Design a protein around this motif. Structure first.
Motif, PDB file in Angstrom:
ATOM      1  N   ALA A  20       0.828  -1.200   0.000  1.00 21.34           N
ATOM      2  CA  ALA A  20       0.000   0.000   0.000  1.00 21.34           C
ATOM      3  C   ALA A  20       0.872   1.265   0.000  1.00 21.34           C
ATOM      4  O   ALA A  20       0.539   2.269  -0.637  1.00 21.34           O
ATOM      5  N   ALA A  21       1.991   1.217   0.707  1.00 22.75           N
ATOM      6  CA  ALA A  21       2.883   2.359   0.761  1.00 22.75           C
ATOM      7  C   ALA A  21       3.495   2.599  -0.611  1.00 22.75           C
ATOM      8  O   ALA A  21       3.510   3.724  -1.097  1.00 22.75           O
ATOM      9  N   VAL A  22       4.014   1.552  -1.238  1.00 25.52           N
ATOM     10  CA  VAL A  22       4.599   1.730  -2.556  1.00 25.52           C
ATOM     11  C   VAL A  22       3.569   2.329  -3.522  1.00 25.52           C
ATOM     12  O   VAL A  22       3.909   3.205  -4.317  1.00 25.52           O
ATOM     13  N   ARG A  23       2.317   1.876  -3.444  1.00 17.33           N
ATOM     14  CA  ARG A  23       1.253   2.399  -4.307  1.00 17.33           C
ATOM     15  C   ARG A  23       1.114   3.916  -4.119  1.00 17.33           C
ATOM     16  O   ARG A  23       0.841   4.662  -5.062  1.00 17.33           O
ATOM     17  N   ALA A  24       1.344   4.345  -2.886  1.00 17.36           N
ATOM     18  CA  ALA A  24       1.178   5.717  -2.449  1.00 17.36           C
ATOM     19  C   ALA A  24       2.159   6.841  -2.728  1.00 17.36           C
ATOM     20  O   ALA A  24       1.731   7.983  -2.886  1.00 17.36           O
ATOM     21  N   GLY A  25       3.444   6.539  -2.755  1.00  9.68           N
ATOM     22  CA  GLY A  25       4.445   7.564  -2.952  1.00  9.68           C
ATOM     23  C   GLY A  25       5.676   6.959  -2.317  1.00  9.68           C
ATOM     24  O   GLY A  25       5.563   5.868  -1.758  1.00  9.68           O
ATOM     25  N   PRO A  26       6.837   7.624  -2.324  1.00  6.72           N
ATOM     26  CA  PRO A  26       8.007   6.989  -1.712  1.00  6.72           C
ATOM     27  C   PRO A  26       7.825   6.484  -0.282  1.00  6.72           C
ATOM     28  O   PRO A  26       6.917   6.922   0.440  1.00  6.72           O
ATOM     29  N   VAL A  27       8.716   5.579   0.125  1.00  9.87           N
ATOM     30  CA  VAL A  27       8.648   4.975   1.453  1.00  9.87           C
ATOM     31  C   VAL A  27       9.905   5.090   2.317  1.00  9.87           C
ATOM     32  O   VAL A  27      11.007   5.314   1.820  1.00  9.87           O
ATOM     33  N   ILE A  28       9.695   4.955   3.621  1.00  9.95           N
ATOM     34  CA  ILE A  28      10.748   4.936   4.621  1.00  9.95           C
ATOM     35  C   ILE A  28      10.432   3.662   5.410  1.00  9.95           C
ATOM     36  O   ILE A  28       9.446   3.608   6.158  1.00  9.95           O
ATOM     37  N   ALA A  29      11.234   2.623   5.209  1.00  9.70           N
ATOM     38  CA  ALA A  29      11.027   1.354   5.911  1.00  9.70           C
ATOM     39  C   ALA A  29      11.575   1.522   7.318  1.00  9.70           C
ATOM     40  O   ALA A  29      12.765   1.768   7.496  1.00  9.70           O
ATOM     41  N   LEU A  30      10.711   1.385   8.315  1.00 11.87           N
ATOM     42  CA  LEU A  30      11.142   1.556   9.687  1.00 11.87           C
ATOM     43  C   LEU A  30      10.938   0.348  10.595  1.00 11.87           C
ATOM     44  O   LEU A  30       9.949  -0.386  10.489  1.00 11.87           O
ATOM     45  N   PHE A  31      11.898   0.139  11.482  1.00 12.24           N
ATOM     46  CA  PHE A  31      11.785  -0.914  12.475  1.00 12.24           C
ATOM     47  C   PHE A  31      12.252  -0.288  13.774  1.00 12.24           C
ATOM     48  O   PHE A  31      13.323   0.324  13.820  1.00 12.24           O
ATOM     49  N   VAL A  32      11.454  -0.438  14.821  1.00 10.12           N
ATOM     50  CA  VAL A  32      11.780   0.141  16.120  1.00 10.12           C
ATOM     51  C   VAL A  32      11.926  -0.934  17.169  1.00 10.12           C
ATOM     52  O   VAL A  32      11.008  -1.701  17.405  1.00 10.12           O
ATOM     53  N   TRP A  33      13.083  -0.974  17.810  1.00 11.32           N
ATOM     54  CA  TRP A  33      13.337  -1.964  18.845  1.00 11.32           C
ATOM     55  C   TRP A  33      13.115  -1.320  20.212  1.00 11.32           C
ATOM     56  O   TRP A  33      13.888  -0.465  20.631  1.00 11.32           O
ATOM     57  N   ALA A  34      12.044  -1.725  20.894  1.00 16.13           N
ATOM     58  CA  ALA A  34      11.695  -1.198  22.221  1.00 16.13           C
ATOM     59  C   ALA A  34      11.297  -2.320  23.170  1.00 16.13           C
ATOM     60  O   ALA A  34      10.144  -2.437  23.580  1.00 16.13           O
ATOM     61  N   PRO A  35      12.260  -3.158  23.552  1.00 13.62           N
ATOM     62  CA  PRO A  35      11.902  -4.249  24.458  1.00 13.62           C
ATOM     63  C   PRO A  35      11.283  -3.897  25.825  1.00 13.62           C
ATOM     64  O   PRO A  35      10.213  -4.388  26.127  1.00 13.62           O
ATOM     65  N   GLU A  36      11.914  -3.059  26.644  1.00 14.04           N
ATOM     66  CA  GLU A  36      11.334  -2.749  27.965  1.00 14.04           C
ATOM     67  C   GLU A  36       9.818  -2.497  27.920  1.00 14.04           C
ATOM     68  O   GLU A  36       9.100  -2.633  28.922  1.00 14.04           O
ATOM     69  N   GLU A  37       9.360  -2.129  26.732  1.00 19.47           N
ATOM     70  CA  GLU A  37       7.958  -1.878  26.438  1.00 19.47           C
ATOM     71  C   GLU A  37       7.188  -3.213  26.431  1.00 19.47           C
ATOM     72  O   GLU A  37       5.969  -3.233  26.516  1.00 19.47           O
ATOM     73  N   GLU A  38       7.921  -4.321  26.315  1.00 14.91           N
ATOM     74  CA  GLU A  38       7.359  -5.673  26.267  1.00 14.91           C
ATOM     75  C   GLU A  38       7.184  -6.296  27.658  1.00 14.91           C
ATOM     76  O   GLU A  38       6.876  -7.484  27.795  1.00 14.91           O
ATOM     77  N   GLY A  39       7.401  -5.491  28.685  1.00 12.61           N
ATOM     78  CA  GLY A  39       7.212  -5.953  30.041  1.00 12.61           C
ATOM     79  C   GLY A  39       8.051  -7.101  30.537  1.00 12.61           C
ATOM     80  O   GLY A  39       9.279  -7.039  30.540  1.00 12.61           O
ATOM     81  N   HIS A  40       7.356  -8.139  30.985  1.00  9.35           N
ATOM     82  CA  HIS A  40       7.969  -9.343  31.533  1.00  9.35           C
ATOM     83  C   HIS A  40       8.329 -10.265  30.365  1.00  9.35           C
ATOM     84  O   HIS A  40       9.039 -11.263  30.526  1.00  9.35           O
ATOM     85  N   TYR A  41       7.867  -9.892  29.176  1.00  9.76           N
ATOM     86  CA  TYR A  41       8.101 -10.710  28.005  1.00  9.76           C
ATOM     87  C   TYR A  41       8.982 -10.147  26.896  1.00  9.76           C
ATOM     88  O   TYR A  41       8.606 -10.163  25.728  1.00  9.76           O
ATOM     89  N   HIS A  42      10.150  -9.636  27.267  1.00  9.49           N
ATOM     90  CA  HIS A  42      11.094  -9.126  26.281  1.00  9.49           C
ATOM     91  C   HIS A  42      11.698 -10.368  25.618  1.00  9.49           C
ATOM     92  O   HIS A  42      11.904 -11.395  26.272  1.00  9.49           O
ATOM     93  N   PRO A  43      12.013 -10.286  24.315  1.00 10.92           N
ATOM     94  CA  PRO A  43      12.579 -11.425  23.591  1.00 10.92           C
ATOM     95  C   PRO A  43      13.811 -12.037  24.257  1.00 10.92           C
ATOM     96  O   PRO A  43      14.690 -11.321  24.749  1.00 10.92           O
ATOM     97  N   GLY A  44      13.864 -13.368  24.251  1.00 14.55           N
ATOM     98  CA  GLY A  44      14.976 -14.080  24.843  1.00 14.55           C
ATOM     99  C   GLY A  44      16.172 -14.164  23.914  1.00 14.55           C
ATOM    100  O   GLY A  44      16.101 -13.771  22.746  1.00 14.55           O
ATOM    101  N   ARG A  45      17.269 -14.697  24.439  1.00 12.27           N
ATOM    102  CA  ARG A  45      18.499 -14.829  23.690  1.00 12.27           C
ATOM    103  C   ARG A  45      18.350 -15.410  22.291  1.00 12.27           C
ATOM    104  O   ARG A  45      18.680 -14.745  21.306  1.00 12.27           O
ATOM    105  N   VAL A  46      17.861 -16.641  22.181  1.00 10.15           N
ATOM    106  CA  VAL A  46      17.764 -17.229  20.848  1.00 10.15           C
ATOM    107  C   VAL A  46      16.777 -16.525  19.942  1.00 10.15           C
ATOM    108  O   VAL A  46      16.997 -16.450  18.735  1.00 10.15           O
TER     109      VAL A  46
END
Ligand SMILES: Cc1cc2nc3c(=O)[nH]c(=O)nc-3n(C[C@H](O)[C@H](O)[C@H](O)COP(=O)(O)OP(=O)(O)OC[C@H]3O[C@@H](n4cnc5c(N)ncnc54)[C@H](O)[C@@H]3O)c2cc1C
Ligand SMILES: CC[N+](C)(C)CCCS(=O)(=O)[O-]
Ligand SMILES: [Cl-]
Ligand SMILES: [Mg+2]
Ligand SMILES: [Mg+2]
Ligand SMILES: [Mg+2]
Length: 485
Positions: A20-46
């Motif tokens: 949908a973004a490409v259909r729309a006009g240029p894009v900015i691919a974004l990824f945000v890493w915010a674990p503490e926001e995941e509470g007691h379930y932040h991603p584990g080592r593996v």
């Protein structure tokens, strides 16, 4: 300008938001890493190791198509969005839905803040065959059991959207932003423990595609007749991929559906049966999202409350023994070892070890859920919650609660020649099959010859089955008595 917010849809094929973004006009691919926001379930080592590698492949893909992936490290994804838009001058933000509790809230808070700030926000389905709200009974209420739910999913008035091709090209809004925030997914300690993963897995969508192909063109045929194989390449191995949206289940469903028609035609019974069981597997993942959406606190709050006053043992070393694979029951300990060392477990063993966890040791299911989440390569809140709730008996379709599985017999079913137990328990690598699943009986001479000293390099059953049934009963008598109030 338009912003594509990647979360757990790490792929360029059949990605509604991206398309949908490409259909729309240029894009900015974004990824945000915010674990503490995941509470007691932040991603584990593996899980983190997988994410790190999957994001590299994703970035590499996007570049091949024209844009880079911009990564941001923060404590608040929503805030990060705002600072990105309010720096780039983007007017819209496209993203794909997620149905786990933590995501549900953050996503709403996101739509609110962003829209109420002059930003157009559109959402799509990238992770399911049908949004949980599209699947319902005649009256319109959410199904309360899998079979009813899955029968409706397969008999819908319309088919799941068909896989979209990835963009042919992408224009990128501001390429001066490509050099962004480095993300650190491993500490030096962890780098060490991750060293063998690369030898077995290849995170990312490209390899996910490869795995799907391998599976459908090989193992799927015998998927059904191999349901009792504990440690063999008889399954798809797509779970880690599926968790991060590296592979479209809609594509998986399409390929499986074409095979099913071809095999029905040929009248190949094994194939049909295998197709049905595998589809039920895909079905169970879809159901995990169904439940999480229709019960926002399912990762901690049980659906059924008949086990409300049950006196769960809270014994710390019972727990430690379980984690360490020091329970005394070969199959259970073999599973805990494989999990600890590799982050992987066949479904059958996951049932065997979690079952033992709630019926023999009688520990709180939240603890087993959390350990699994920290150690599984495909750690998934929804699938992990569903699994534990089912095993514990707090689900409308759980098996009878007052039933304790015998690891010795499970051993006979799933590991007949003791190959599994011996691969994961070197201490038992010399024990003959007649005693591999119940060494505590074995005659002194066989133990001596095998180098096994019960209580030492292999423990005695930490809790006997008979003694186990008794505490289970004693526990019920108690909860029933607590009910009287
Ligand atoms: C206590 C317990 C905990 C579990 N925790 C997880 C988890 O954290 N993450 C996870 O993805 N799965 C979990 N499962 C489900 C299942 O064990 C894994 O999805 C499966 O072992 C992965 O192997 P596969 O990819 O070869 O699956 P296949 O047999 O090849 O099936 C294909 C896909 O179907 C889905 N699937 C299959 N079985 C189930 C199931 N029983 N429940 C939900 N989805 C299923 C998965 O996406 C799997 O990749 C858990 C099961 C139990 C009993
Ligand atoms: C037996 C399955 N193994 C090989 C371990 C994982 C499949 C490879 S991957 O990472 O490309 O899916
Ligand atoms: Cl009961
Ligand atoms: Mg199998
Ligand atoms: Mg197998
Ligand atoms: Mg299962």
């Amino acid at each position: 300008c338009s912003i594509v917010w990647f979360r757990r849809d790490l792929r360029v094929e059949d990605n509604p938001a991206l398309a949908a973004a490409v259909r729309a006009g240029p894009v900015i691919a974004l990824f945000v890493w915010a674990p503490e926001e995941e509470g007691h379930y932040h991603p584990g080592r593996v899980s983190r190791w997988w994410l790190k590698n999957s994001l590299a492949q994703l970035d590499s893909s996007l570049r091949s198509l024209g844009t880079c992936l911009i990564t941001k490290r923060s404590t608040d994804s929503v805030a990060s969005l705002l600072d990105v838009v309010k720096s780039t001058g983007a007017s819209q933000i496209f993203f794909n839905h997620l149905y786990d509790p933590l995501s549900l809230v953050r996503d709403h808070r996101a739509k609110d803040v962003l829209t109420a700030q002059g930003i157009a926000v559109r959402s799509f389905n990238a992770d399911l065959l049908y949004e949980p709200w599209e699947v319902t009974d005649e009256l319109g209420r959410p199904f309360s059991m899998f079979a009813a739910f899955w029968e409706r999913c397969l008999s819908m008035p319309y088919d799941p959207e068909s896989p979209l091709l990835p963009p042919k090209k992408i224009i990128s809004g501001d390429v001066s932003k490509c050099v962004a925030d480095p993300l650190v997914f491993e500490d030096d300690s962890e780098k060490g423990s991750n060293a063998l993963l690369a030898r077995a897995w290849s995170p990312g969508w490209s390899n996910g595609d490869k795995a799907l192909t391998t599976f459908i063109n090989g193992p799927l045929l015998e998927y059904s007749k191999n349901r009792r194989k504990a440690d063999s390449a008889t399954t798809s191995f797509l779970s880690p991929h599926l968790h991060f949206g590296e592979v479209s289940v809609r594509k998986v469903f399409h390929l499986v559906r074409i095979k099913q028609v071809a095999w029905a035609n040929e009248g190949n019974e094994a194939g049909e049966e295998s197709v049905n069981l595998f589809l039920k597997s895909i079905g169970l993942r879809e159901y995990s999202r169904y439940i999480s959406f229709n019960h926002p606190y399912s990762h901690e709050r049980p659906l059924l409350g008949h086990l409300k006053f049950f006196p769960w043992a809270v014994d710390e070393n019972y727990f430690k023994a379980w984690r360490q694979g020091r329970t005394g029951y070969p199959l259970v300990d073999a599973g805990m070892r494989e999990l600890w060392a590799t982050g992987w477990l066949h479904d059958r063993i996951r049932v065997v070890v979690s079952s033992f966890f709630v019926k023999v040791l009688q520990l709180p299911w939240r603890w087993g859920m959390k350990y699994f989440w920290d150690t599984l390569l495909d750690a998934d809140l929804e699938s992990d919650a569903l699994g534990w709730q089912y095993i514990t008996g707090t689900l409308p379709d759980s098996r009878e609660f007052d039933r304790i599985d015998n690891p010795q017999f499970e051993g006979y079913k799933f590991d007949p020649n003791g190959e599994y137990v011996r691969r994961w328990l070197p201490e038992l690598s010399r024990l003959p099959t007649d005693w591999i699943h119940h060494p505590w009986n074995a005659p002194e001479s066989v133990l001596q010859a095998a180098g096994i000293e019960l209580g030492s390099n292999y423990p005695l059953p930490i809790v006997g089955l008979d003694e186990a049934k008794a505490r289970l009963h004693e526990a019920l008598s108690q909860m029933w008595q607590l009910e009287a109030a």
